Amino acid sequence: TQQPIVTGTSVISMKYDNGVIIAADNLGSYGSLLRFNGVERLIPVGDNTVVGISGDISDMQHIERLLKDLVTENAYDNPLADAEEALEPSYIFEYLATVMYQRRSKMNPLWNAIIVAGVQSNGDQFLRYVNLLGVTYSSPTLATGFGAHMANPLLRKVVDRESDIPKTTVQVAEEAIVNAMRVLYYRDARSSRNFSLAIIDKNTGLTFKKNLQVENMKWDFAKDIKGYGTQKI
Amino acid sequence: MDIILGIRVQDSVILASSKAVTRGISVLKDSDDKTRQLSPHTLMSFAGEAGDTVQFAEYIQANIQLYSIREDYELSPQAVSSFVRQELAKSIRSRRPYQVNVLIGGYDKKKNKPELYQIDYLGTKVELPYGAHGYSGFYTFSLLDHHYRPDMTTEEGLDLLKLCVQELEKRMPMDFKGVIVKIVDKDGIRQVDDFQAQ
Amino acid sequence: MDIILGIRVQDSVILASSKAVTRGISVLKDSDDKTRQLSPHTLMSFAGEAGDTVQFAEYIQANIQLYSIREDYELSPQAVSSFVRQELAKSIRSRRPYQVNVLIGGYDKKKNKPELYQIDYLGTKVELPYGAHGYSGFYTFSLLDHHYRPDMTTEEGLDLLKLCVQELEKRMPMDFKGVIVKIVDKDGIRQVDDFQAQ
Amino acid sequence: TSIMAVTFKDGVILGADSRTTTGAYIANRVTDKLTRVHDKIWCCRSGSAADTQAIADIVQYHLELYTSQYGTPSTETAASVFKELCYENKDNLTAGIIVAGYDDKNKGEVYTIPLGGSVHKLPYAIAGSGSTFIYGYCDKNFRENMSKEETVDFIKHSLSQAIKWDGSSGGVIRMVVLTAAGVERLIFYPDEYEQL
Amino acid sequence: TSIMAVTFKDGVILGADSRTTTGAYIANRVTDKLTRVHDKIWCCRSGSAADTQAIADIVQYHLELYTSQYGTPSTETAASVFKELCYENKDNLTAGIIVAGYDDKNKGEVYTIPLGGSVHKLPYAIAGSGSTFIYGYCDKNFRENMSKEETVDFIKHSLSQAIKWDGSSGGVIRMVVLTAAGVERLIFYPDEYEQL
Amino acid sequence: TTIVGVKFNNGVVIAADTRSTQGPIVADKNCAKLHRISPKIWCAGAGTAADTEAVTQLIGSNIELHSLYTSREPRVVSALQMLKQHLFKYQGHIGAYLIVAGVDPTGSHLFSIHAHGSTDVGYYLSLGSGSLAAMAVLESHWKQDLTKEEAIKLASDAIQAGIWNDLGSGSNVDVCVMEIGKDAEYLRNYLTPNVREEKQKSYKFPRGTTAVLKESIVNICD
Amino acid sequence: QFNPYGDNGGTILGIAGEDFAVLAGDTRNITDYSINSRYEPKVFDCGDNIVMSANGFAADGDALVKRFKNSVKWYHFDHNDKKLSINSAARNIQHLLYGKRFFPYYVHTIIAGLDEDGKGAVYSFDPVGSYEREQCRAGGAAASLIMPFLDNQVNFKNQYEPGTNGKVKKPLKYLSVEEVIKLVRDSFTSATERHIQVGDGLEILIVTKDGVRKEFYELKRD
Amino acid sequence: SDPSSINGGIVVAMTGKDCVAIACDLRLGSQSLGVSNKFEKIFHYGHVFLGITGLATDVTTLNEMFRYKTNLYKLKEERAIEPETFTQLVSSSLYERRFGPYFVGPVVAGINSKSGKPFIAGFDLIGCIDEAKDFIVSGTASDQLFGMCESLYEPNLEPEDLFETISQALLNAADRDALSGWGAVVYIIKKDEVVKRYLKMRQD
Amino acid sequence: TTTLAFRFQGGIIVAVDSRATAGNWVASQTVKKVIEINPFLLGTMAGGAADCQFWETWLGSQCRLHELREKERISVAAASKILSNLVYQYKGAGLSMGTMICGYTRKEGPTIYYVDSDGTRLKGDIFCVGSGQTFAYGVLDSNYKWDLSVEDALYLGKRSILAAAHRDAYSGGSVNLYHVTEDGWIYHGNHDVGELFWKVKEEEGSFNNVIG
Ligand SMILES: *C(=O)[C@]1([C@@H](O)[C@@H]2C=CCCC2)NC(=O)[C@@H]2CCO[C@@]21C
Ligand SMILES: *C(=O)[C@]1([C@@H](O)[C@@H]2C=CCCC2)NC(=O)[C@@H]2CCO[C@@]21C
């Protein structure tokens, strides 16, 4: 049993007609101190999988090392490592899920919330969540921490049920997701304005966008607000 | 806790109460009478917290006697019990509540019927053919549920109690030093000085 | 706790032990024998934690019987008690200690003298003319301190115990359902089947 | 929360972030922590929003009645009323307050009332969770008798840093200028102070 | 405690206060928080003196054996050994460590290992109780590729501020310069940095 | 609970969901969280129902008496001052969280009060367990200079976010529009997107199914 | 401190017919007041004509099901592909659960199938292995809302013959799969109305001598 | 510990066609110990009926209080109190004890003597009014009651039918509650008459 | 829960209720509280269902193993001590069980052993375990006779559980009867307390306080 120290906030994601999108800001908080700003919390694995991690950063870095090893190990005595026997997103996930549950069962968890996004070899979209308790679930949209409360409601307005997936384009989806990141910067006190976004499309492959920024914010109306009730100036 | 038992038969109410008073490691007295006569036809038994128990009983006694003098009349059993319930229901929400449970057995001279009332320290009141407080009910209620009859004679009530006391003296961990039994009927309240072997 | 008493008279050791076994709200048994014969001339009484009590007694019994067979000899009372003290003194610092107190009464055939040993669960051992465990000593030691004499006959010991049991049945809050008495002397261990009214 | 008051050549300026939180949630991102207790006597509020509001509302009431009887109150007197309320009720309040006022005889003045209810008159003062991060910066960059533009700049930079490091601070930077000329309201948005 | 490491044009510099406390008592006013784990790989220690010493002693041992077999270790490798010890034993340690080394190929490098055992490579890093007060100052005054004199100046000013506000920091300012030219020890006394 | 307030060019609109819960059990599937303080000053409540309700009526009662005494229309800032000083005095023990809006001689207003007594002002606001779903929508669609119809839509959409995404919210949407020149219009069940489907069977029992021991007539006439 | 447990909500129901058996469960997975998924299957086909569900703490429920399925696999490996009779699966699960008697799988598990005589069968388990064969059993969040209903409509409890003066109990004629599905659906739509953790969807698995079939119905999403 | 789980008991009210019904069990226990099988939890003042679950002493005290208050009301108003009004009297009386409440779960049932309209309402321990059109439940078996009602209930049932429905709801919910049962009583109410029936049920 | 077992001329009578509760919630009214170790041994279950069910079924396996090894029927003393000693190994772990091990062997005759998770092992003639025990003891103590007939003995047990089912909120459902003879135990049905109460009331005249 431990307690997180340096932490990463929300991880939001959703699936569209041809793939899945996933994003996370670049902050590593230390309590109320927004200590580290160049933290990448999106871990690509191969070219069909991206693992988004929130929670304790030291554990994230540990999950990172585990993922690199999975790749190395899979290559060993595997003439099809970059073909029929390459790592599928579901393999990556089942592995992590397994570890998360073993660690909670030993009363020494990896203090994180994880979203594994990607495209299976047969084109299927893959989006599943696993956390420090070893709990797992899937939904057309998935978010961790704060984004669970504020992002999911927005993203679900685009893809409310399975049948909405084929009707959602990369444009619409990336837009929903970019807007959600802005909303989170508005109401989540542990968020950063900079973030990374990644798309895994069954046709265009993996697109990893770094150094994005929340833009087009509304703050002007702030000037019209004074006092807290009766004050006039 | 102490033993507080009550049984309402055809023409009277019988109350049995343990005689022991234990303070920690020792039994200080084995002849304690845990009862107070509220009026010629109303008797109240009680069990609970050390000092509160008697202070409450005597306080109630005082008030009923005062009412009897003022009105030159004896309040019905039902009336005396409602008064007592209210006193406890007040106490339950006061600074330091009275931790006392009581059984009120009386003979209603106007209705010509005996009545048994059970009221715990919270002011919970119920009228029953027989009742008890504490653990006592746990050992005796199955015996009373079995042998009880509305037309029982006072003699049959005493035999049924004796049976209850024997069960208590067999399965209950504590030595309550026997009980003192009192009968309340149309002619008042009398004590059965012979139960040590009836 | 239960009643564990022991008295060493002129030519024997007498052990008295309550017969009640209470589990919470009920007395499950009133004929329990809280003793184990360790060897023909050595008896051990015990009281303490629910399961530990018998498990310990039987464990000790087994070891003494094994020693008796291996050596075709009977260890002296003093020897059996030092063995038992050590077993408890080990237990006191283990993961889950035996919460058992014992009295060991034996007749040393070599010395031709009775011996009474008191050992609590910590492994505290002392040899005495009479002793007890729990609260029992509190009510009885003043009676024993008064009437005890080194040259008492077994009959005088039984009379002194009876006096102790009566004091216990008067001032002690719990009903221990009487005691089972056993005598240990040059001829072995026998039970006084008649103490329910001796 | 990040709040500060700075005296300068022509008077004094108040500044603050516009964030109120309930845990990690931002309950209000456009809060106005700069409260008026008199025409030229304002305060900066940190700590409990409920406590500081109740305190301020009462000080304003007290100063209104004071004015009705003895004329305009000195900044020192306003700070004294705040102090009275904070010290005497220290057990039930969580209020860090900075009082700032402009007098014609005294010019600008700043009194800081920290948690225990003590009073401290200073050339400038900072407070709130975000302040801890700008102690060094402010101590190195503050100068007495700065111009209005320099002072606005000092506050803008100081607070943007406090907002940068403190998750408990954010939104816009509000300022209130108190000089003989009157009362001026200033606001600065994210896109401006973040890249300073 | 106040400690920092800053990379610059010719390498990197380490700095720290010289105070160790046990409550409000100063147990040591001339402590040396700049510890050598290799010829050109040093660390800054904060948190538990006992834990950081034990950690450092072990890293030095590990790097000595590494050198015996594979030659000089990279600064990254030293930071990795520290990390291993801090992460794997996070439940029993209270160690904030900054690793700083000079490589000929990599020049100066700085890795900060905060409480949980995570690693962060940065242009410069600050840590310890006193650091909180200089976050704003440092963020505003740090520049990449500064000269040795400028860097010594940055550290000297930053720390003097940290020492100023933090009762848990004090004494003298120690510095260690790591460049291709070698290893230089610098010390600055109260009478100098206090009036900066 | 999900309650929101949204100002529009010539007034203010407040709305709320209709779910009432005791732990995980839905006690009232159509409670009313919109209360009136005065004809043109309405409240949306969240937190302890008995408290939001009791506090709205107490200040409402006093606001009426104040109105009658001053011969003037009640002002929102007055209900706000009376509410906050009452809540403050009780140190948060009166679990009332309200969004108070309304129009009066000085214009149209929108505020929020928390149990501890702090108040806030804004163009759009929301409180309750649905707070975050609603706010997400508001931060995404609000804009200055909304028309009455846009404000209603925005507010109504914000509650839907809560109804669907928050377990603490559900059932219907209640709205109340307060426009500067007209009467306030209370729209009870403005939206009812959760009608129960027809049961699969009827559970009407054949008469005589229940065993009866004794029967009698109860006397009601004195 | 770290709490190794959580509650994912959900409700499941198992009813044994004369020659069939059903095991249903909503498809909503929650955490506090948030919905994690509106569709996350909770009732599984484990081979050998056995359906199972471990409701409560999902991580535990998943591990258990996964562990049992693997048990069926080895049963075949070690006993010449013999079929695992539901009574045997039951005893097996008891041991799986009791193995963690001192760090339990926080779940209420139920399995359904046909016994060795082709009769419908349901077994419900305790978090620590206690088990019993039953007629019907609801488990989870709305269990308390559904069981009373089932006692009345499935075992005709408290229902007597009209006119017999409650002297003749309503005969226990047994239901068909179609009638049972109706009770199941009504049971959930009712539970959906009063419990905030029940909704989104209902998935039913039906077991007969011909195997396992699945049916799906939507539930309110608020 | 929980004042609301000491004595046990339940109450349920339902609206029908020009009628209302209110029912309750008759148990009064002290934790595991059954003490009385005749503790009725329904009372009436004029044509207004009030059921009360919770701590028995408070159930008794509240009844005595409302009798007292409805008596003075009749003397001053010169008419019997109505369901809607009584409901407000109950609410304000409970809230008056906001920080030292009575541990009860009241339920009001009756028909407005002037409008003929049926009326039922529930309250939490501090007076919050729950005014449902269908049914209202209270007591240690309230979860079970919600389940029974939600399924068994349908609008505009005739008196004879509502009786069957409310009785089955009460009965089967009580049988899943350790602290409820030991007898039951159902009140069928109409503008002109009110019938009270005792039900036959398990006694365990 | 209410469970009892008593010895008499015709062997042993074993009667239990069948209610399962978790708080005030009645989980079941049809639970088995008697484990058939084997054709000659019965075990009663009070306390933790899983604990009793598990270890008593395990006891069955140990008894079987004994009889295979010693080609002789296991004694009640020995079977009870296997359970007793197992349980004692777990003392302090949190096992929760109050149990009666009942059998009729040629060597011992009718034998009842009370075994709980505290490690207590007691041989006796009459035992009642459970939150309803005191009620059953009242009925049993005043009507018990060693010379009771198998018919009357069975009824006494059934009646004693009934008394408890009535007063104890945590007891009820139905009554399960068993008669233990040296040739094995014989099941004597499941009696729903509901119906049993009214029947007994009328025929016996007891439970006068309840209106029927
Ligand atoms: C700042 O101190 C802060 C504000 O919410 C508060 C709001 C209005 C005026 C006083 C200042 N107080 C708090 O409790 C939060 C959390 C950290 O600091 C806040 C942002
Ligand atoms: C600094 O972190 C500090 C030092 O005592 C310590 C000493 C030597 C090397 C590591 C740093 N740690 C402490 O616990 C005290 C109190 C506050 O900070 C210290 C001064």
Ligand SMILES: *C(=O)[C@]1([C@@H](O)[C@@H]2C=CCCC2)NC(=O)[C@@H]2CCO[C@@]21C
């Ligand atoms: C909402 O805040 C909510 C409502 O029950 C309540 C009802 C009427 C007026 C105030 C709001 N309050 C609660 O305590 C429950 C639980 C979560 O939120 C509720 C649904």
Ligand SMILES: *C(=O)[C@]1([C@@H](O)[C@@H]2C=CCCC2)NC(=O)[C@@H]2CCO[C@@]21C
């Ligand atoms: C009785 O002991 C009881 C039973 O639920 C339980 C069920 C099956 C076999 C063992 C006995 N145990 C309990 O924990 C509950 C609560 C009180 O007693 C129960 C009814």
